[PDB]
Design a protein around this ligand. Structure first.
Ligand SMILES: NC(=O)c1ccc(OCC2CCC2)cc1
Lengths: 198, 193
C-alpha cells in the first residue's frame, strides 16, 4: 500500500531520500521549521521510507478514523532527539520505554511539539560531536485528547465508570496545545529527518 | 479478514463469545490447559473477538514472516492475570507499561506456571483468569534484567533485533515480548483451585 510518490526501493523495506531545495516537499518542511527556528540553518531534509512502520501506522489511522468518525485524527508535529537514537527511530519508530522524563510531565510517553522551537532546545535535539542537531517531522494520531497528568502510563478514560474507553492522546492545554503525548506503538510515523546547525 | 471459526458480530468490532462445552474448539483449548492443570476446575472458556487487535497482530505476523523468511514465528502460550486487568486486555491486549528477563509482557509455555496465584490472583469469589495467547516469538535469545527491547542478533548491526527473549533457548518455559500487537489474546479461561 506504499505511497506512489516514494522512490522505488527494489523489494527493500527501508530508505532515506535526500530532498532538493526548491521542490514544494522541501520548502513546506523548511517553512514549517523556520516559522519558529529562524536563527538555525538546515543542512538537509531526508524523507523516511519505512514500509513496515508505514503499514502499522496506516492500520492504526484507519481504526481511529472508524472509531472517532469525521475527526481530523492526524497532526504533523516535531520531535528533537540525540544522534545515538536516530538509527533506532528510522528503523523502529518512537518507543515510550526509551523516553526521558519531560521537564513538565503530562504522562510517561513519547512527546511531540507543535513548534519546532521547542524541539530545537539542546535538551531534546542534543548537538552531536560535529555540532549537528536532529529533529523529526512526525505524523501523529492525536485523535481526541485531554489535559495529561504526570502519573499516566496510558491516556485516561473519557468516563470514570468505563475505564477501558480511552482518549487517544494527552496535551499540556486543550485550548492552546503546544505538546502531545502518545502511549502506544505505531501511533506516530517519522516522515522527515531535519539535520540543522547554529 | 476475520477468521472463519469466529461467530457473526452483527456489525460490531468487539465481543466475548462463551464456548459450548463438548464441541471441538472448547475441547481443543481445555486439553491445552489440562495437560498441566488437570486438578483445577474450569468454569468457562470465552473466545476473544477483537477485530482491531486481530488486524494489528496479523500485520505484524505478515511483517515477521517476511523479515525471518519463514512462517514458524507463532507459539500458543498462557498468561495469568488479575480480574481487574481482564477488561483492559480484552479491549487493548498486553501492555508492557502496566521482570528478571526484561521489561516486557511475560507468557508461559505451561498453564501450571500461569496458574500460580502470584499471576492469576483469585478474585473475591475465588475465580482465577488465564489467557491462551497467540505470540510472535520469532527468533529468540536468552533475556536478562533491565532489557527494554530484545538484544541485537549481531552488535555489528545494532537495529536488527531478536523478536523475543526466553529463560532458556534450548528448553524454553517462558517468553517476553516488548512491542504492542506481538500478542493476541485468543481465549479467556475462568477456573478455580
Ligand atoms: N503472567 C504470567 O502468566 C507469567 C508471569 C511471569 C512469567 O515468568 C516470570 C519469570 C521471572 C521468573 C520467571 C511467566 C508467565
Amino acid at each position: 500500500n506504499l505511497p506512489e510518490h516514494w522512490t522505488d526501493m527494489n523489494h527493500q523495506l527501508f530508505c532515506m531520500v535526500q530532498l532538493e531545495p526548491g521542490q514544494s516537499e522541501y520548502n513546506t518542511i523548511k517553512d514549517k521549521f523556520t516559522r519558529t527556528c529562524s536563527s538555525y540553518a538546515i543542512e538537509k531534509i531526508e524523507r523516511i521510507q519505512n514500509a513496515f512502520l508505514w503499514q502499522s501506522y496506516q492500520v492504526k489511522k484507519r481504526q481511529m478514523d472508524i472509531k472517532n468518525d469525521h475527526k481530523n485524527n492526524e497532526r504533523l508535529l516535531f520531535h528533537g532527539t540525540d544522534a545515538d537514537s536516530v538509527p533506532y527511530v528510522n528503523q523502529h519508530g518512537f518507543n515510550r520505554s526509551c523516553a526521558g522524563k519531560n521537564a513538565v510531565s503530562y504522562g510517561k510517553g513519547t512527546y511531540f511539539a507543535v513548534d519546532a522551537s521547542y524541539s530545537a532546545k539542546d535538551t531534546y535535539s542534543k548537538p552531536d560531536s560535529n555540532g549537528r542537531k536532529h529533529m523529526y517531522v512526525v505524523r501523529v494520531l492525536t485523535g481526541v485528547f485531554t489535559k495529561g497528568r504526570a502519573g499516566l502510563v496510558t491516556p485516561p478514560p473519557k468516563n470514570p465508570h468505563n475505564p477501558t474507553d480511552l482518549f487517544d492522546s494527552v496535551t499540556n492545554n486543550t485550548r492552546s496545545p503546544k505538546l502531545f503525548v502518545v502511549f502506544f506503538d505505531n501511533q506516530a510515523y517519522p516522515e522527515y529527518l531535519i539535520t540543522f546547525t547554529a
